[PDB]
Amino acid sequence: IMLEDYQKNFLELAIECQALRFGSFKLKSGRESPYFFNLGLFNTGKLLSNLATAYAIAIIQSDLKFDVIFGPAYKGIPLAAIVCVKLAEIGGSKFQNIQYAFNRKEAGIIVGSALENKRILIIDDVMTAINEAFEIISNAKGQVVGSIIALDRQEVVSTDDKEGLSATQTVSKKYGIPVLSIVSLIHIITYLEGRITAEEKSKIEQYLQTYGASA
Amino acid sequence: IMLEDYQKNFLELAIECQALRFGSFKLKSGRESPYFFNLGLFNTGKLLSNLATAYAIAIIQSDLKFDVIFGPAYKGIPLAAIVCVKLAEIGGSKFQNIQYAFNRKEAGIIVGSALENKRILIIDDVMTAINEAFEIISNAKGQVVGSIIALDRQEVVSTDDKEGLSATQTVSKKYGIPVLSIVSLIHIITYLEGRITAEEKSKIEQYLQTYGASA
Ligand SMILES: [Mg+2]
Numbered sequence: 001i002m003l004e005d006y007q008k009n010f011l012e013l014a015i016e017c018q019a020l021r022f023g024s025f026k027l028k029s030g031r032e033s034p035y036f037f038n039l040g041l042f043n044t045g046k047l048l049s050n051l052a053t054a055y056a057i058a059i060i061q062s063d064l065k066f067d068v069i070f071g072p073a074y075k076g077i078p079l080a081a082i083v084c085v086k087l088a089e090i091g092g093s094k095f096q097n098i099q100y101a102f103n104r105k106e107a108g109i110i111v112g113s114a115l116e117n118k119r120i121l122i123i124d125d126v127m128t129a130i131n132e133a134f135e136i137i138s139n140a141k142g143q144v145v146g147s148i149i150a151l152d153r154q155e156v157v158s159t160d161d162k163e164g165l166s167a168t169q170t171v172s173k174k175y176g177i178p179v180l181s182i183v184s185l186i187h188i189i190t191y192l193e194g195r196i197t198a199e200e201k202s203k204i205e206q207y208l209q210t211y212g213a214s215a
Numbered sequence: 216i217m218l219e220d221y222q223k224n225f226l227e228l229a230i231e232c233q234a235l236r237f238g239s240f241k242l243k244s245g246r247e248s249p250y251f252f253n254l255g256l257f258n259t260g261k262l263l264s265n266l267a268t269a270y271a272i273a274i275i276q277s278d279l280k281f282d283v284i285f286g287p288a289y290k291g292i293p294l295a296a297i298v299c300v301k302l303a304e305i306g307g308s309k310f311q312n313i314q315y316a317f318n319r320k321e322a323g324i325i326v327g328s329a330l331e332n333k334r335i336l337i338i339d340d341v342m343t344a345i346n347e348a349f350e351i352i353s354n355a356k357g358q359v360v361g362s363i364i365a366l367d368r369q370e371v372v373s374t375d376d377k378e379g380l381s382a383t384q385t386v387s388k389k390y391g392i393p394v395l396s397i398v399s400l401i402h403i404i405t406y407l408e409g410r411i412t413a414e415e416k417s418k419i420e421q422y423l424q425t426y427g428a429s430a
């Protein structure tokens with residue numbers, strides 16, 4: 001009803017491959033969470049194919065205009081790559097010539113074409129690092145025009161500031177750009193209706209209440 | 216006649232995107248070469264799509280049996296990824312559950328599933344580094360069963376040993392495994408017939424004579 005078909009498909013695969021788990025989980029903060037998410041578990045050719053398609057459709061539907069998809073080392077490298085491919089495969093003539101690029105985290109160089117006057121989309125797995133990418137890109141004269149992750153957790157950044165912004169909202173405000181996501185926690189909650197009873201369904205909604213950011 | 220359709224298609228794209236150039240080029244050794252090759256120039260979604268397909272068909276046709284495709288950091292990360300995807304998309308039911316993996320070059324950890332008792336294919340751009348990958352994989356109890364690159368240059372490793380082995384042959388002998396390639400220099404030479412006259416066509420064949428390894 002609210003959920004697109006690519007979002008429903010992503011979430012069912014997410015649950016099947018165990019990238020999305022439900023139960024009792026303690027976050028790094030110590031806060032207790034009704035689910036756990038690891039995109040890494042999208043780890044086969046089939047799963048990666050579907051993951052790439054799900055990112056690709058979110059990007060096409062967003063209407064965002066860009067020249068280069070950029071994935072921060074290390075998790076963003078394979079993601080940038082498979083999604084660049086997918087865009088060209090299902091996106092039509094406009095997405096044929098989209099370049100991809102990423103960075104060596106040397107102990108900084110960019111692997112790809114010159115970013116000067118190029119509009120850049122950042123792709124990564126999650127958003128929790130962000131400034132690093134913007135720095136690298138702006139140094140190369142690249143203009144970041146957007147960001148996409150798989151799951152927007154929609155959690156307020158500060159505990160004792162319930163009316164504060166989420167991670168994605170914070171980034172979107174600072175750089176003036178959209179931060180897309182395949183799904184958000186509200187989407188998880190929506191998909192779970194009729195798959196669970198008002199038991200765990202409640203738990204998660206009551207977690208969105210306590211820790212979730214407003215639209 | 217000798218060249219498969221995926222090889223013809225790869226080479227035409229290679230020439231179109233300038234990843235394959237002809238002219239006078241000095242190698243690192245100082246040796247003079249009739250062509251230059253950079254896989255990096257396969258840099259758009261369309262080009263990456265076709266590159267992935269070309270690797271994927273070479274792998275399917277080879278009949279090699281493996282569980283994991285592994286790409287050495289950094290150039291092998293996106294390659295491992297898009298090709299893992301492609302295998303699942305065109306390879307049928309047998310390639311659905313192939314995992315992919317790579318390595319952080321930390322100043323070593325593997326990003327992916329446990330490699331123990333898993334049969335591994337290495338994918339990289341060229342072969343000139345090789346031991347690094349084998350070490351990493353054997354430590355994790357992974358069994359390397361093969362390697363694939365885009366272009367086999369077929370050059371003898373030692374100048375003053377004309378009957379010596381090529382780079383790929385050397386690796387194949389040391390580890391007892393096949394080292395596949397989308398194309399070799401003999402394939403380049405074959406494709407160029409009727410596209411050039413006996414002028415540069417000669418030059419390259421006379422370079423294969425001087426510097427090429429025997430079958
Ligand atoms: Mg639309």
Ligand SMILES: [Mg+2]
Nearest residue numbers: 275276277278
């Ligand atoms: Mg066959």
